[PDB]
Structure formats: C-alpha cells, structure tokens
RNA sequence: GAGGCGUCGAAGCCCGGCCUCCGGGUCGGGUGGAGCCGUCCAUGAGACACCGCCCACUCCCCGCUGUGUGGCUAACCCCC
RNA sequence: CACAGGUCCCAGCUAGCCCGAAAGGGUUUGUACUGGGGCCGACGCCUGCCCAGUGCCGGUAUGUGAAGCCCGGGUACAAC
RNA sequence: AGGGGGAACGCGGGGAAUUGAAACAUCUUAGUACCCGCAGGAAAAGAAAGCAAAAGCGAUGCCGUGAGUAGGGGCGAC
RNA sequence: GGGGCGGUAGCUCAGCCUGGGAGAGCACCGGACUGAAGAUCCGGGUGUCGGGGGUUCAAAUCCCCCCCGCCCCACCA
C-alpha cells in the first residue's frame, strides 16, 4: 500500500533510471467536449439505445492503482502498466 | 388565426413510446398557408393569388389573403399579372403553389440540401420537409 | 387496465347520468334587462306553485312589463302580494331591493353573485342567508355554510326567509320512496361498494374483502384517481 | 491627492512633475492593485528588490559581517565590515539611548552567522522589511553590496489587494523618476499571475506633485 | 519618510453632540494668539512628524438595476 | 349484491369535480335543506388502544433546489 | 361562375402496428398501410443570393453511371 | 472522486465571522441531611480546546495537509 514519495525507477524520456515524484492521475469532467458527448444529443427521445445509460452496476469492489510518476529532469508525466489493486492506498514519505 | 402549432387528436392506440409526442411532434406546414386555405374555402369561387402577414397582436396573428375573381376579363387582358386564366391556377392554394406554400415546402433552398425537395417531396417518398 | 369511471361518465353527457330537462320548469331571475337600478318594475304574486324540477315551493310573479317569471317564494306569502324592484321599493318581506337600502340584522335570500344576473347564490327551498355586516365598500353576508362572503352593494336581494324546509330533506323510509326522489333529481343509485368490485372496475378492492390503496387520495393526482376521501385534510374521529 | 483625479490615466513622464513651495522635496509613491493576489505561489507574492536605474535618492543602510576573502571584497566596494559583536548588544537588552537596532535596513552575513541574524534583529526591526530576510538578498557579499549602494528599493506584500513600493524621494530630474517607475512595473508584470490585468491598476503620486493613476 | 504644518489664524484653557474594550479619538461655539511634535526609539509589530493607497464591523446623500407590494385602466378577460 | 339507517370527506358558483382535438360541453330549468366521492349495511346495545411505518393535509426557520436573469473568466466572435 | 364524378398516375397534409434485432425500448418495419383536401392530360419542378475536381460550368425533369462509395446506426441489426 | 455540516473535559457540546493560559451543564467522587421513608443544598477538576504544520503580537477556529461520522451527487480515463 505504502510507496515512497520519491523513488528511483526507469524513465523512457531521458532513457535512464532516475528519481520520479508521485501524485494521482487526475481525470476530466464532461459536458463539452468530445465525440461521445455529441452522441448524447440523440437522448431527445433516445430511450433504449446508447444514450439512455443502459441502467446496470454491478459495479465492482476494487479498482486498480493508477499513479502518475512524474520526471524531475523534464517535468513530463508518465502512466504505465501496473496491476496493484488497492482499496486503501496511502502515499507516505520517502 | 390562433398562435402555436397543431392541436392534434389524442390516441386510443397502444403504441410504442416515442410516438406518443404531441408537442414534441411538430408541423412542417406553415400557419400563413392555413390562413389561405380558410379564406379560399369561405367564398367558393374567389381564388388565392398570395398572402402576407399584416401584423399580429401576440395572442393571435393576422394575415391578408389576396383573392381574385377567376373570371373577369380585366386581369386577363393586361399581362402585368394574368396568371389566373390557366386551369392549374384554379386550386393552386391546397397543393402549395402560392408564396406561403413555396416558402414552407422548402423550395426556398435550391443550392445545398436540395436533394429531397427536388423536384418534389413525394417524388422521393416524403423524405422532404 | 380500467376504464372510465362513474364521475367520468357524467361529464360525457351520458343519458343515465343526465338530468331530464322537460319535466323541469325552474329558474329564477329578477329580470336583468333593466339593470339593478331603475324603479320601473313591479309585479303581483300570481300564484304559489310547485316547481316540479326543484321539488320545492315557488311563486309566480306577473310583471308590469307583462312578463311571467318565477321568484323564489318567501314564508308567509299569500297571493295578491306586491313585489317591487328598484331602490325605490320599501323594505318589506318579499320585496326586492339593492343591499345598500337593506339594513343589517334582517334575513335575506336570492342574492346576486355578480350585479345584474338575477341571483347566483341562495336559491334553495327553505334556506336563507343572514345579513351580518354592511359597509358601503363591501357588504358581508353570512351563507348557509357559515362562511362570510363579500359582495358589492349594487347587487339585488329580497327580504324574508324562503318557504318550506323539513321537506327537502326528510326520512327516505324505504327503497321505493327513495327511488322517487332520484327521478326528481339525478344521482346514480343504487351504487355498490368498491371494496368487492374488482381492481379492474375500481382501484380499491379485489373479489375478497380488503382495500387496495388508502381512501384519502392526493390532490395533485390526475383524473380517474379521485375515489375514497377526495381532497381530505383529515379523516376519522376516534383513536 | 493635491491635484488631478485617480481614475484618469497619464504617461509616466507627465505623472511626475516638479512643483513644490513646501519645505518637503516631493516624496514619490508608486502603489499597485494586484488582481489574483495569493501567497501559495511565490509568483503571486511580490516580495523582492528591484534595482532602480537612477536610485532612490537616499542611501540604504547596509551593515555587513563577512569572514574570509569575502570580507576583503566587501571592503573594496566601500564598506566598514562590522563584527558579530553587534548581535550580542541587540539581543541582550531592550535599551534605548545608544541602541544601533532601529537604524538598519538590511544585513548581509556569511552563512554561519545567519541563524543568529534571524532571531535577534527580527525581534526589534520586524515587519515593514527593516529586518533582513533571505527572499530579498541578505547573503552573498558580492552582488548585494553593489545593489544596496545602487539604492535598490525594498518590497513585501500586504495580502489583499495591494502592494506598494514607493520608489524614493525626488532628488533628480522628472524623467529619471519615470525610468525608476518603469523598473518597478517590469518586475511585477515579469512575475506571472492569473487572468487579465494582473496589475489591475498602477498609480504615481507624491506630496505635492501630480497625483494620478497611470496605465497597467 | 525623523521631520513637517500654520499667522489665511494653532495649540492650551471653557462647554455642547459623541462613541467606547470609561483605551482614547472625533467633532460644532468661543477665550486665545504662536505652537504642539519625534528624535531618544521603549515597542513582537511605529508614528495624527508629514505623504499615499488600503483592510474590520458599519452608516449615509446622489447615479444604475432587479424583484415584492399597493393604486390606475388603455390592452386583455369573465358575468348579464 | 341492493337496501332503509350510520359515518367520514371537499367546495362560495368567474366554485369543486369531470367530459372535449378544438370550438365547446355535463353536473345545472342545481346553489350548501346543494351535489360530488368513498366506507359500512334496518331496529337494540356499543365501537377500546396506538401516527413508530405507509398515505393525506397544513406549515416550514434552516438546508438544498432547475431553466430564465446577472456577474467574473474564456473566445478578435461563439462553444466553454 | 361553383358543388359532384372520373381506370390509375401527380401535388400538399395527417400518419400506425404485427415484423427485424433470435428476447426487448433507440433503431428497424416506413415516410409503408390507412385517412383528408386538390389539379391536369402529364403533373410538378424550372431560368440562379446555384456548382466549387479553385478549374471548368451557367433553367428544369428522367434514364444509365458515380456506389452499396462518403455518412448515419445498442457502432448492433441495419 | 466533488460540495456542505458536526466531531472538544468521562459524555453531549458553547465561543468558531465574536482570536490568547480561557468555556457550560450533566454523569461521576467528596460533604450536609435522615430512625426510616423523602426532598434539597454546599466543594472538585479532567480539552489552547480531533491531528499536524505556517501567517498573526498573544489564533483552538484564518491558510496549507487532513482522519472519523452524516446528507446530496460519481467506473472503462
């Protein structure tokens, strides 16, 4: 669960191992914005298909872990392959 | 003529939901045109040339319908206007050959989108509007 | 599901739920053709008749315009009475005058709702309204309900009580005699109970005894759901 | 204000003009509203120094403790180089009649002395930036001597919604003080803040010169 | 920024309104008639020295603008 | 099942309620002694106790509560 | 000067559902069936605030082709 | 994951914009009082006040990072 605040691991950008700083992946709202949003303009009377939101859970105790690992040497984030399922993640010092 | 759209029968059918709309189903036939048909009906022989909006009170709309005597030589001799002589011009208002009809039927477009209103609406099987 | 119910049929104009209008011979107006004001008009009690359609006493009054119209009868009436109309009528039992000329504390009937329509309130046999308070702004009258309504003093009304009473609601005795009253009116009778009429016919009941839904019903509910206690604010009388 | 209004905009040349019968030779004031003023980015916060291109017009008192070759360098530039003896006088007693605190504006130290400077002179000289604090320069003999003698003007931020750094007193030509006003503006705007009009308003005002709002 | 303001009339004396944590400041009348100040720097934070813009609670004339409410009828509408 | 009898409920008539696509219409040649809806079922003796839940009804400080409107940001305009 | 009729066709409105999706509601059936008004021997469209291979063209129908191509759509069937 | 409100002495909390060592009642303990039954007095303190840091002159609450409870909202980016 605990993971260090800074930790040395591989950076593809600079193509070398270096220290990365951890924060959480942050995701956008809707309501402009997208081609899927424009798909929800057929909910005028579109009660059966896609824009009615197909009303059903079931909806899963877990999530996986998704955690930006941020480069110090160029300031660009990366997200990558992980599989740490977590229900009580804590970020701590390091 | 009254304001608003069409006020429609209410069904006894057991239909599908999304066909039950009454106010969420709207006309394509214009009110200006309706005004003509009331006028043309009232006096059996006097025939609608065109019509225009003469203003409105915001509760009702008013239109003035121009009617002409289908037989009366005066119109017929002077060629500035003489479009009443032909048979077609008798019963022109119902089919939509007037000002109000032409504009409502989407003969107003002639460039882009003119694909299903050309030559006519029910030449394409009602894909037009 | 279910179909139109018992009230919903009445509004249609259905003939089981329509009054007869040819064994009826009623209505009362004070002649609003000459407005509330004007003394121009007097009449003579021509007869005291039974009105068949209101099953009530009525008086026939013969006007000096030469017109025959009914005025709702007072107590103590006797043929050959003079009824006068206009503000120049004396204040007397069975005479008709505007509210302003009428002093407070006196029994009154047949008051106009809106000035010049010959009455819209208090036209029932044996029932009478009492003039409690009077202001030239507005004249407050106490209704058969007990509710004080404000009226404009240009309205006409007549002095006295209305004749009869104890004769517009007395014991029905048996089914035969009860039946004779419902032909004189229009009420759907005999009517069974909803509780063992099906859940198709009526929202409540089944085949067995048991209700289906509670009697007192929402006021904002649609038509065809006004059953039970309709627009009730409270129910019952004991814990 | 003696003259003009503070919602009409002028140039920086014609915002300062010499015209005083007063004993006082017009003290110049620069005052600025910040729009999106914060203290959770250091780039909203305006605590810094700016070196004016013709100086204040009165000298900044710098007292310096330096040790090593930096002590000599500091002397060359035209300085006494005072001892750390003075930290003990300041700290020990709340005396008056000879106290040399309440008479300094800045301090420089070489790095081991700095913790003592903080605690002792901070007590007396305090807020209104008469104590030394690390954010405006107070370490390094080299550059900070050169700026203090060049009559650098000191700045610190009253949160909500104003910052003021009055450039100095008029002891020079009208244009020289317009060049001064430009430097102060360029430091504020160069720090990047949010939205439009990060300098909501700028005003140039005085004891008995024009008192005017200017562009910004 | 340790000085600034005035004989166009100022402290300091005598009262009125005054608020308040009675801390002390504001303020209209007048006697007056030419000083009171800060420096020292006590004070965690310094000067009604003087010059600027401001932040608390809050109050008021004027300019702009909504809604709520009462009168009017000219629209419009319900009654006969 | 009806039934006489009993109870509870709402409404001042430019009403309540309800019918009609609309124009309009029933109750109503009615006016609270009215007429509309449920519940129970002559007569005699009675109808205990509970509003926690569900329903109805009135009120609602505080909280919350859409579009319209308003303000700030954005956009050379607009989306946002 | 008119009602009304006329084998279908034509113009303008009003406008379903079984069915398909192995069920089912968007979608599909279909602008179909069905209904109302109305003209002719063709009807109607029709002499440019057009096209847009930026180049070339200048009223309008229809047939062949462009093509099951662009695009739509439980992105599923269609 | 977004918003708001309350977690404070053993308990429930007051002030939170009204800032400091600083609160309040009620349990509980001690004392009168009483043949008994019974009623009523008089004392006591337990949280810089949920955690950790900063601005401030002396901030519990302001700022920055949050645990716990509750109400209204939210997977495939």
């Amino acid at each position: 669960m605990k993971y260090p605040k800074q930790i040395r691991t591989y950076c593809p950008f600079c193509k070398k191992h270096t220290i990365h700083k951890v924060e959480r992946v942050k995701k956008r709202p809707r309501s402009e914005l997208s081609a899927g949003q424009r798909r929800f303009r057929r909910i005028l009377k579109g009660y059966g298909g896609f824009p009615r939101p197909k009303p059903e859970g079931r909806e899963k105790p877990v999530k996986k872990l998704d955690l930006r690992f941020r480069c110090t040497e160029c300031g660009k984030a990366h997200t990558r392959g992980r599989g740490f399922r977590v229900k009580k993640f804590e970020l701590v010092e390091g | 003529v009254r304001k608003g759209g069409r006020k429609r029968p209410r069904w006894k059918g057991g239909r599908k939901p999304s066909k039950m709309g009454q106010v969420k189903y709207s006309p394509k036939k214009s009110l200006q045109w309706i005004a003509e048909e009331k006028a043309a009906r009232k006096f059996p022989n006097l025939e609608v040339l065109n019509s225009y909006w003469v203003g409105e009170d915001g509760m009702y709309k008013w239109f003035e319908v121009i009617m002409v005597d289908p037989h009366h030589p005066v119109i017929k001799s002077d060629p500035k206007i003489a479009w009443i002589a032909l048979k077609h011009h008798k019963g022109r208002v119902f089919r939509g050959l007037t000002s109000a009809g032409k504009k409502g039927r989407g003969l107003r477009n002639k460039g882009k989108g003119a694909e299903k209103v050309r030559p006519s609406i029910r030449a394409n099987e009602g894909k037009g509007k | 599901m279910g179909k139109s119910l018992i009230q919903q049929r009445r509004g249609k104009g259905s003939p089981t739920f329509k009054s007869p209008s040819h064994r009826f011979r009623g209505a009362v107006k004070y002649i609003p053709l000459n407005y509330t004001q004007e003394k121009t008009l007097r009449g003579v009690v021509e007869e005291i008749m039974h009105d068949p359609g209101r099953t009530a006493p009525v008086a026939r009054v013969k006007f000096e315009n030469g017109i025959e119209k009914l005025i709702i009868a007072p107590e103590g009436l006797l043929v050959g009475q003079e009824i006068y109309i206009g503000p120049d009528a004396p204040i007397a039992v069975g005479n008709t005058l505007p509210l302003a000329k009428i002093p407070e504390g006196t029994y009154v009937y047949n008051i106009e709702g809106i000035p010049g329509d010959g009455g819209k309130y208090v036209r029932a046999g044996g029932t009478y309204a009492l003039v409690v308070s009077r202001e030239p702004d507005k004249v407050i009258v106490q209704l058969p309900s007990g509710e004080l309504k404000a009226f404009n003093p240009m309205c006409r009304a007549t002095i006295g009580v209305v004749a009869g009473g104890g004769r517009l609601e007395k014991p029905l005795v048996k089914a035969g005699k009860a039946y004779y009253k419902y032909k004189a009116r229009n009420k759907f009778w005999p009517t069974p109970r909803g509780v063992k009429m099906n859940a198709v016919n009526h929202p409540f009941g089944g085949k067995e005894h048991h209700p289906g839904k509670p009697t007192t019903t929402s006021r904002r509910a649609p038509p065809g759901r006004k059953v039970g206690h309709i627009a009730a604010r409270r129910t019952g009388r004991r814990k | 204000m003696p003259f003009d209004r503070q919602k009409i905009v002028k140039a920086v040349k014609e915002a300062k003009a010499r015209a005083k019968p007063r004993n006082f030779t017009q003290s110049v004031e620069v005052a600025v509203n910040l729009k999106d003023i914060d203290l959770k980015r250091p780039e909203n916060r305006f605590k810094l120094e700016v070196v004016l291109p013709h100086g204040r017009g009165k000298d900044v008192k710098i007292a310096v403790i330096a040790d090593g070759a930096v002590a000599e360098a500091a002397r060359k530039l035209g300085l006494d180089v005072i001892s750390s003896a003075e930290l003990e006088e300041i700290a020990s007693s709340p005396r008056q009649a000879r106290k040399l605190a309440k008479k300094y504006d800045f301090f420089i130290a070489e790095a081991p002395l700095m913790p003592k400077i903080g605690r002792y002179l901070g007590r007396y000289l305090g807020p209104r930036n008469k104590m030394p604090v690390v954010v405006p320069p107070t370490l390094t003999d080299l550059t900070p001597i050169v700026e203090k003698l060049k009559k650098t003007v000191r700045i610190q931020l009253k949160n909500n919604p104003v910052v003021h750094a009055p450039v100095g007193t008029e002891k020079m030509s009208d244009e020289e003080i317009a060049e001064n006003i430009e430097a102060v503006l360029n430091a504020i705007i160069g720090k990047l803040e949010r939205g439009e009009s990060q300098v909501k308003s700028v005003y140039v005002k005085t004891t008995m010169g024009p008192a005017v709002k200017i562009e910004g």
Side-chain angles (χ1 to χ4, degrees):
Chain A
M1 296 299 158
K2 19 182 55 59
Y3 204 53
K5 178 163 50 185
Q6 74 204 330
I7 198 55
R8 169 163 70 174
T9 183
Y10 188 50
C11 173
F13 307 125
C14 304
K15 203 180 151 293
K16 45 170 68 68
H17 273 66
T18 205
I19 318 174
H20 288 270
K21 315 296 167 52
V22 197
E23 329 67 24
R24 172 68 68 173
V25 190
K26 292 154 186 318
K27 306 178 159 55
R28 300 184 310 196
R30 309 290 278 121
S31 296
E32 184 190 64
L33 191 49
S34 196
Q37 227 289 306
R38 293 176 296 176
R39 293 178 192 200
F40 311 128
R41 294 183 315 180
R42 293 194 293 113
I43 204 188
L44 294 208
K45 289 284 200 186
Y47 302 134
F50 184 56
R52 189 177 63 133
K54 310 183 193 292
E56 183 176 61
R58 300 177 174 187
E59 39 182 62
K60 212 157 198 184
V62 295
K63 293 295 197 303
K64 296 165 178 196
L65 196 72
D66 205 48
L67 282 167
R68 304 192 167 162
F69 299 142
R70 192 197 55 113
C71 194
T72 201
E73 311 176 304
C74 36
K76 300 194 173 311
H78 56 264
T79 174
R80 58 190 186 185
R82 72 197 66 87
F84 199 11
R85 50 190 58 202
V86 296
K87 303 213 279 178
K88 54 187 183 198
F89 190 74
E90 66 190 288
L91 197 32
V92 296
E93 292 50 50
Chain B
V1 203
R2 81 292 185 287
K3 290 178 84 176
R6 294 180 67 264
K7 285 175 269 180
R8 311 204 180 199
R10 270 286 296 174
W11 49 251
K12 300 283 182 74
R15 285 178 174 203
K16 81 177 199 179
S18 184
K19 306 276 184 175
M20 300 189 184
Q22 292 307 142
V23 64
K24 291 296 184 175
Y25 202 146
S26 293
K28 41 170 159 181
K29 182 180 196 84
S30 219
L31 278 55
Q32 185 183 17
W33 200 353
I34 304 170
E36 295 182 306
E37 308 281 18
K38 291 190 168 64
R41 288 179 194 262
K42 181 55 176 281
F43 281 111
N45 294 3
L46 310 200
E47 186 71 75
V48 172
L49 188 282
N50 280 329
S51 50
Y52 46 115
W53 160 84
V54 289
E56 68 174 301
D57 47 273
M59 278 142 181
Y60 297 89
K61 299 211 288 309
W62 288 311
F63 308 88
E64 282 192 302
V65 167
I66 309 169
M67 292 194 304
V68 48
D69 215 325
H71 288 279
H72 240 63
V74 213
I75 310 84
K76 259 174 281 316
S77 59
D78 299 72
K80 290 206 188 190
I81 161 164
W83 308 297
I84 192 57
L86 291 186
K87 293 206 167 186
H88 303 295
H89 298 146
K90 183 184 198 284
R92 70 149 65 182
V93 61
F94 302 93
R95 303 197 285 134
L97 312 193
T98 66
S99 188
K102 201 178 306 173
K103 284 180 172 73
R105 282 170 56 213
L107 274 306
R108 176 181 317 175
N109 60 286
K110 66 168 289 172
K112 182 169 287 312
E115 280 193 358
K116 64 184 189 290
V117 282
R118 297 302 285 167
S120 308
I121 300 189
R122 282 166 200 73
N124 287 298
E125 290 184 284
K127 301 188 187 291
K129 280 305 307 180
Chain C
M1 297 148 199
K3 298 189 189 287
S4 285
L5 302 179
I6 176 162
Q7 181 55 16
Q8 309 190 250
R9 289 159 187 183
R10 201 160 304 248
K12 304 180 178 263
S14 298
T16 306
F17 295 89
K18 180 157 239 299
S19 298
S21 317
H22 54 264
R23 210 50 62 212
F24 274 29
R25 297 172 176 90
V28 157
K29 301 211 175 300
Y30 295 132
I31 315 292
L33 303 171
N34 58 269
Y35 309 128
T36 48
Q37 322 296 130
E38 292 177 290
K39 177 62 173 303
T40 193
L41 200 66
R42 84 104 177 81
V44 48
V45 184
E46 160 168 63
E47 181 139 77
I48 306 183
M49 204 82 161
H50 162 48
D51 194 59
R54 278 184 294 207
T55 181
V58 75
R60 290 170 53 149
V61 179
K62 180 75 173 178
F63 291 117
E64 79 175 332
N65 309 1
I67 287 173
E68 203 281 297
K69 186 60 193 174
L70 314 193
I71 308 291
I72 179 63
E75 171 61 7
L77 180 62
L78 181 47
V79 285
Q81 188 182 108
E82 295 301 310
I83 163 155
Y84 295 98
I85 322 194
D88 304 266
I91 325 176
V93 181
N95 291 3
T96 300
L97 66 176
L99 324 180
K101 305 295 264 84
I102 303 191
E104 290 98 306
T106 58
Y107 293 89
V108 72
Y109 52 87
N110 191 233
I111 178 162
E112 314 192 298
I114 295 169
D117 59 13
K120 289 284 176 64
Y121 286 64
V122 196
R123 305 183 55 242
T127 309
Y128 31 95
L130 181 54
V131 176
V132 290
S133 295
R134 183 186 73 182
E135 289 174 286
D137 316 74
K138 55 189 100 302
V139 172
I140 299 97
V141 181
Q142 183 177 100
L143 293 174
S145 51
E147 182 151 283
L148 290 180
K149 184 58 179 90
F151 289 105
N152 295 273
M154 284 180 211
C155 307
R156 280 178 287 185
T158 307
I159 318 294
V161 283
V162 185
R167 189 56 57 195
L168 283 104
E169 196 77 54
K170 67 170 187 173
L172 296 194
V173 190
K174 49 190 287 211
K177 195 184 131 165
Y179 197 9
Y180 298 152
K181 181 57 162 189
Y182 305 116
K183 297 180 261 181
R185 306 167 58 191
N186 175 238
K187 186 177 183 74
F188 190 83
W189 176 101
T191 190
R193 290 169 304 164
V195 57
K196 63 177 291 295
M197 295 175 313
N198 309 295
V200 72
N201 293 297
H202 180 66
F204 311 142
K207 294 188 187 169
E208 274 304 303
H209 284 68
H210 39 60
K213 292 188 169 177
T215 62
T216 180
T217 57
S218 208
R219 297 177 174 179
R220 190 159 78 174
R225 221 191 306 182
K226 302 297 190 179
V227 290
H229 304 182
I230 43 169
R233 288 178 263 158
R234 58 154 297 174
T235 44
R237 65 194 200 166
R238 305 182 178 132
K239 284 194 173 188
Chain D
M1 311 206 274
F3 324 119
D4 293 294
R5 193 64 167 124
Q6 55 176 111
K7 301 182 174 287
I8 187 182
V9 288
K10 291 298 167 70
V12 278
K13 320 299 183 172
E14 66 181 304
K16 175 75 201 59
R18 184 182 283 253
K20 67 293 176 316
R22 293 181 58 163
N23 177 256
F24 216 154
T25 183
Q26 295 170 34
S27 282
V28 192
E29 301 86 44
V30 165
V32 193
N33 302 330
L34 301 184
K35 200 190 198 197
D36 314 277
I37 185 180
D38 211 51
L39 61 162
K40 306 297 165 51
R41 316 195 303 169
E43 59 178 76
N44 298 123
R45 191 180 177 92
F46 200 45
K47 177 169 175 56
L48 201 65
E49 286 193 308
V50 58
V51 201
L52 303 165
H54 306 287
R56 290 205 303 153
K58 296 184 179 174
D59 294 282
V60 176
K61 185 177 201 191
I62 180 68
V64 177
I65 305 178
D67 301 272
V70 304
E72 306 279 283
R75 285 191 180 97
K76 292 166 154 51
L77 307 160
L79 235 302
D80 197 57
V81 185
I82 206 166
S83 47
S84 288
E86 185 57 58
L87 302 180
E88 289 79 55
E89 295 205 77
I90 293 165
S92 62
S93 286
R95 69 193 180 243
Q96 62 193 305
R98 60 189 190 81
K99 194 62 156 304
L100 292 156
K102 305 301 298 283
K103 281 193 171 32
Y104 293 111
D105 294 312
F106 281 107
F107 246 70
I108 289 170
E110 187 53 54
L113 301 304
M114 202 62 207
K116 303 211 297 151
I117 313 295
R119 285 179 275 147
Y120 299 172
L121 272 81
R123 191 279 211 190
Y124 305 91
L125 279 158
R128 187 167 296 184
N129 202 354
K130 309 176 301 291
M131 50 184 175
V133 207
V134 267
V135 178
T138 47
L139 283 166
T140 308
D141 299 301
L142 285 309
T143 319
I145 291 166
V146 173
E147 303 167 329
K148 286 287 156 55
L149 279 159
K150 201 150 167 307
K151 293 192 293 203
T152 181
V153 58
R154 72 190 182 238
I155 333 186
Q156 190 183 60
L157 181 61
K158 187 196 168 177
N159 309 305
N160 312 95
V162 281
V163 62
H164 319 279
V167 294
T169 182
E170 168 163 51
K171 290 304 184 288
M172 48 198 91
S173 301
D174 292 290
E175 191 161 295
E176 286 175 77
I177 298 285
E179 291 293 292
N180 290 356
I181 294 155
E182 286 284 342
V184 171
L185 291 163
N186 295 332
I188 310 181
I189 73 169
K191 292 193 197 188
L192 188 42
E193 318 187 68
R194 295 80 48 144
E196 74 167 305
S197 311
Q198 48 202 295
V199 277
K200 203 149 59 178
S201 293
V202 183
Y203 314 86
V204 181
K205 299 194 178 203
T206 32
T207 287
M208 194 56 163
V212 285
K213 175 188 185 190
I214 57 172
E215 272 171 53

